Amino acid sequence: RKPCKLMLQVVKILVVTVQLILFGLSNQLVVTFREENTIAFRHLFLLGYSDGSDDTFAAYTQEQLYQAIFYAVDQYLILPEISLGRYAYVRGGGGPWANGSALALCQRYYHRGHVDPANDTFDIDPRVVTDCIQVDPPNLTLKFHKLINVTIHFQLKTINLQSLINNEIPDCYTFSILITFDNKAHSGRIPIRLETKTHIQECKHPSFRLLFDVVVILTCSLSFLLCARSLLRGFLLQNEFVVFFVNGWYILLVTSDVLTISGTVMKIGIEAKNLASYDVCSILLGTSTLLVWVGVIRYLTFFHKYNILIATLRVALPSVMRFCCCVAVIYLGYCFCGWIVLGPYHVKFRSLSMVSECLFSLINGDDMFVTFAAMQAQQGHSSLVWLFSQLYLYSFISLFIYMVLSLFIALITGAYDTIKHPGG
């Protein structure tokens, strides 16, 4: 009834997230289309690039430098002669206007640029001039002292004909293309990178799954209304309680409403400005479904046979939070120590990100023989540091390894005490 409505919401959002996962399978075939094309154009425009080169597809020779510039130049020259896909290029100007290239060799470098490190002097008008060469579909050089970044933009149209095997009418992708020689460091290591976007549109010459999605949206709307009614019942009970864990009979419903509104927003409203907002709204729906599973397990406990494990979660977080505070203090201190130490020798130490990176290497064991090994293998320097690195790292290792089972089993015996009360 009313719990039949709740379980209907459970299966209904379950089917809606099944439709989400269906949307995911379809868009995932599509994004496989994306990635196929992505590595594709990487081959395609790419000159001298390699598999795995994304770590280091970067230049030393200026003759190297212009080499790739021309290489892409010819690629734009001769793509229809050469490829295996079917790219199409109509006018499509950017990113600065005027007019349409479609290959725009863009170059930004500073407007005032006197630079003589031999006299130890420089005079820089840090305003940057960008010269662009428009390249009509059927050579010029830049100062290496002068450079900031060099850009090729170009876009190619195609139709995902593989959607016939998905029984669908094919769609039109337009992959926009920014190849970049980049020297923001200005250090000599000119990284090249190809980035791309794509517009998906329907064919020029041209919905039951979409109707089923719309019906799912309407069902989600009815479910959110049911959540609103249940919350009004809970609020009337709260007004009676004021006048007179399990944690989520309200709150999970509110999260579900957030997910449902997110899905509605993803279907239509922000769906005319979709892509990233669609991704984030999927981000919302996931927690909704996670709550869907969780409260499904709560309600489908049916007391779980007396819910001993349900109550087991209860007492410990009362200790576990302060213990969490303490251990996190330990974690942050270890993090500060990393923020100090790793600069002398580390790739795994690179930023506060990499500091977070060390922390999994705490709890997990993947990086220890990696890192604690190889740093001991000593790229190294300044052998007191080589002592001190062992001094730090072995010290970091043992502490949580002992004490964390201490915390978990301490609250374990805490729940053992919660089973000392609770096993009777």
- Which residues ranging from 357 to 416 are in contact with a second copy (CB under 8 A)? 357, 360-361, 363-370, 372-373, 376-377, 382, 384-385, 388, 390, 394, 397, 401-402, 405-416
Residue from 6, 16, 59, 194 binding a second copy (CB under 8 A)? 59
When the beta carbons of 36 and 131 are compared against a second copy, the nearer one is 36
Residue in 9, 10, 16, 17 binding a second copy, rule: CB under 8 A: 17
Using CB under 8 A, which of the segments 218-226, 247-255, 266-274, 288-296 binds a second copy? Answer: 288-296
Q: Which of 65, 192, 194, 252 binds a second copy (CB under 8 A)?
A: 65
Please state the closest distance from residue 203 (CB atom) to a second copy, in A.
6
Check the chain for breaks (C–N over 2.5 Å) and list the residue before each, or none.
138, 206, 244
> Smallest distance from the beta carbon of 252 to a second copy, in angstroms?
12
Instruction: Please choose, out of 209-217, 226-234, 238-246, 300-308, the segment that lies near a second copy by the rule CB under 8 A.
Output: 300-308
State in angstroms the smallest separation of the CB of 144 from a second copy: 5
Q: Is 99 a binder of a second copy (CB under 8 A)?
A: no
Q: Which is nearer to a second copy, 203 or 228 (CB)?
A: 203
How far apart are alpha carbons 320 and 326 in whole angstroms?
A: 10
Given a contact cutoff of 8 angstroms between Cβ atoms, the answer to whether 61 and 67 are in contact is yes
Could you say which residues in the range 117-156 bind a second copy, by CB under 8 A? 117-122, 124, 126, 144-145
Q: How far is CA 336 from CA 32, 43, 332, 368, 373, in A?
A: 40, 42, 6, 19, 21
Q: In this chain, which of 93, 100, 234, 286 binds a second copy, going by CB under 8 A?
A: 286
Residue 250 or 386 with smaller CB distance to a second copy = 386
Residue selected from 9, 19, 37, 262 as contacting a second copy according to rule CB under 8 A: 37
In the bound state with a second copy, the residue whose beta carbon lies nearer, of 146 and 233, is 146
Q: Which is nearer to a second copy, 244 or 369 (CB)?
A: 369
Alpha-carbon gap, residue 392 to 49, rounded angstroms? 40
168 belongs to the binding site for a second copy (CB under 8 A): no
311 binds a second copy (CB under 8 A): no
Specify the residue, 44 or 217, whose C-beta has the smaller distance to a second copy.
44
212-251: which residues touch a second copy (CB under 8 A)?
Answer: none
What string marks each residue from 325 to 354 as x (binds a second copy by CB under 8 A) or -? xx--xx-xxx-xx-xxx-xx---x--x-x-
User: Please, which residue, 237 or 279, has the CB nearer to a second copy?
Assistant: 279
Given 172, 200, 246, 270, the residue binding a second copy (CB under 8 A): 172
